[PDB]
Amino acid sequence: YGESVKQAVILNVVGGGDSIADPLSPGENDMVHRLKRLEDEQKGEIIRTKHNAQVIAKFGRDLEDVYKFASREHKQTPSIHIYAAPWDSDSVFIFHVISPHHLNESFFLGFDLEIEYVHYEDLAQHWHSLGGRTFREAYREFFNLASRSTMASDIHKKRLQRSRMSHPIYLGVHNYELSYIAIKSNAMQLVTDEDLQKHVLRGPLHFQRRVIMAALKYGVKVMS
Amino acid sequence: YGESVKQAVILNVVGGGDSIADPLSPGENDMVHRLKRLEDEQKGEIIRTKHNAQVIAKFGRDLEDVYKFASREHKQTPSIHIYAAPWDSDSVFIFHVISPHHLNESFFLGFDLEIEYVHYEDLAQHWHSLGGRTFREAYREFFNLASRSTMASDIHKKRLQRSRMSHPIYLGVHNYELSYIAIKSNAMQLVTDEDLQKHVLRGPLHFQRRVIMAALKYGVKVMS
Amino acid sequence: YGESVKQAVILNVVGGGDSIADPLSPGENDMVHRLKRLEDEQKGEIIRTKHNAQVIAKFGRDLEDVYKFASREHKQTPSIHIYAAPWDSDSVFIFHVISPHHLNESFFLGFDLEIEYVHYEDLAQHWHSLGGRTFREAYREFFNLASRSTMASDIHKKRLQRSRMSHPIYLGVHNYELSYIAIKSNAMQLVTDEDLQKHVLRGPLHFQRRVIMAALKYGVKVMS
């Protein structure tokens, strides 16, 4: 039963009430932006039309009075940068999440949906004296960990290893309305909580990539 | 040649003239709904604008008369519930079609596009004295029949068997404007008529899932 | 570094600034057409509304004068036809590009994204006396060349061979604003220039099929 309501809330986010595009589709991202602009303009046009109706009605009244009178006298946000792996591009991809106001505050979130694996790493740099993997390293590491899975197909492992030594494909940026700290916590919830993870990392690829974004925006509340 | 016109009519349905969303994409379903609302509002705004133009013109005329006058004196529907299999989610999915006005009138339609198999079962309950598989059973049965295909890859069969003992992923509901009896007949046409079936169960996955819905709405008329 | 700007310009085309639909999705093609119509109508409605505001304001002024007056006296384009292979439909597809004003001027462009292969052939007929593969042949040939790739999976080769002897699935027509000669040159640039090709034939399938169209519209300028 518990499963029922989980599915229901998840489904409600990625249906209406959230304009989430597939992170691997810059085209769907454009389309979602275009629908939003159209909605916003249409609201504005409704306002203008009603303004014009009111001005018109007021002039009708004034016209009546002028008739009568004459008649008498007649007589910033965290940026989520998206990269697909050069192999199995639809299933293997990486987020680079950047804090808007710290030079070196960011984290990595890597996904292999073929084996349903997610890896998080903090990339922040912090100096301490009483008074830190690079992005590339995190990328390379991620392919090693994924190729480790016993669940990984022999052929899968081979493409993971080739992606590891190749350049990823940048697909652009998402910007949602939450803090660095919140998205960071969401990302870690995604990796640490096994239940949430099993609910997010499943179903048709297109839907699951949107659900991933929903999980980034809400964490466990993606099933609230 | 006959093939040509078939392709043409099929293509015409899933192009314009039918707002069919991919059943496995709640996001595309939302988008199609949003485009419809925008179209509907835009028609209404066109009407309001023209109303305002007419009222304005009428006031122009009235203003003329007032000028002249003063101048003289100057001197329900079946619900299609959609579930993806937990494995091969993009290719293996199930419809539960529910009659709007009978407590226990529904049917199952299961699809495996990897092997291009479709299975129909009536789930209705009818008592008879002169005066019936459950949904779960139909689900379990479906994976058995599919794993039977000689055409099924060894690995395919294994995931079918795992899906059989796992919980499917609900992706929501479609509601089209036809009767239970008609959609039911369409579903059976889909399974019984080999020609229609070969025309519906092919091509890129996204397109084929939309064509499936078109077939549910029109049956053989999907190629008329 | 050079890679960076390439990715950036590519991404800019298939983001905004170009309404490119996935060639394998007649549904997305319809949707893109619908968004365009809505945008076009909304611009027109904005114009009508402002016209009405101006007419209204002018009538307000006129009304004032009538009040005052009364008060005193008080005392063609190349067509790109799209066909998916009957097997591996999402990855194996063919363009038939037809000149608008020559009976027998067209070319073939075949793609297998599984092995990232593109094949171009001129299908034009030209008679010469001082004073030519068919479409089918080009189709059949294409599957032979693709099944030749050493990179091709054994199973891949088998489906290529079956597609070769079967009928492709027509998915419709795209029409972009360029000449036959230009698109023809673009198509050949795509096949001859190894760099462009490596930049176009990669990433998630949906994105890569859109990038292919972008390459057809711009050639090397797709990375300018």
Residue numbers in the entry:
A (entry chain A), B (entry chain A), C (entry chain A): 65 to 139, 361 to 416, 423 to 515
Verbatim from the authors:
Bluetongue virus (BTV) is transmitted by blood-feeding midges (Culicoides sp.), causes haemorrhagic diseases in livestock and is responsible for considerable global economic losses.It is an unenveloped icosahedral virus, belonging to the Orbivirus genus of the family Sedoreoviridae, with a multilayer capsid enclosing a segmented double-stranded RNA (dsRNA) genome. The inner two capsid layers (composed of VP3 and VP7) comprise a core particle which remains intact following infection, whilst the outer layer contains two proteins, VP2 and VP5. VP2 is the attachment protein and protrudes from the virion surface, whilst VP5 is implicated in membrane penetration. Protein VP5 forms part of the outer layer of BTV, with two symmetric trimers of VP5 fitting like pegs into pits on the underlying core.
Here we characterise VP5 at two pHs by crystallography to provide a detailed analysis of the pH dependent structural changes and consider the consequences at the virion level. The low pH form was solved in the native state and refined at 2.2 Å. The low pH conformation at 2.2 Å provides a precise description of this state, presumed to be primed for host membrane engagement. Since the two N-terminal helices are deleted from the construct the crystal structure begins at the H4 helix (secondary structure numbering follows that defined for the high pH conformation), which lies against the body of the subunit, following which the chain turns to run upwards away from the body of the subunit in an extended helix, H5 (residues 90 to 137). Interestingly the electron density for this extended helix is clear, allowing a reliable model to be built, whereas the density in the cryo-EM reconstruction (EMDB 24684) fades quickly away from the main body of the VP5 subunit, despite which the cryo-EM model is similar to the X-ray structure in this region. Likewise the low pH structure confirms the extended helical protrusion that was inferred but poorly resolved in the previous cryo-EM structure. There are some differences between the structures in the virion and in the crystal, for instance in the low pH crystal form the so called dagger domain (residues 410–421) cannot follow the path seen in the virus, due to clashes with symmetry molecule in the crystal. Low pH triggers a major conformational change in VP5 which enables the penetration of the membrane via the extended helical structure. In summary we show that VP5 in isolation undergoes essentially the same changes with pH as seen in the virus and confirm the helical transition to produce spikes radiating from the virus surface. This indicates that VP5 is a pH driven motor during cell entry.
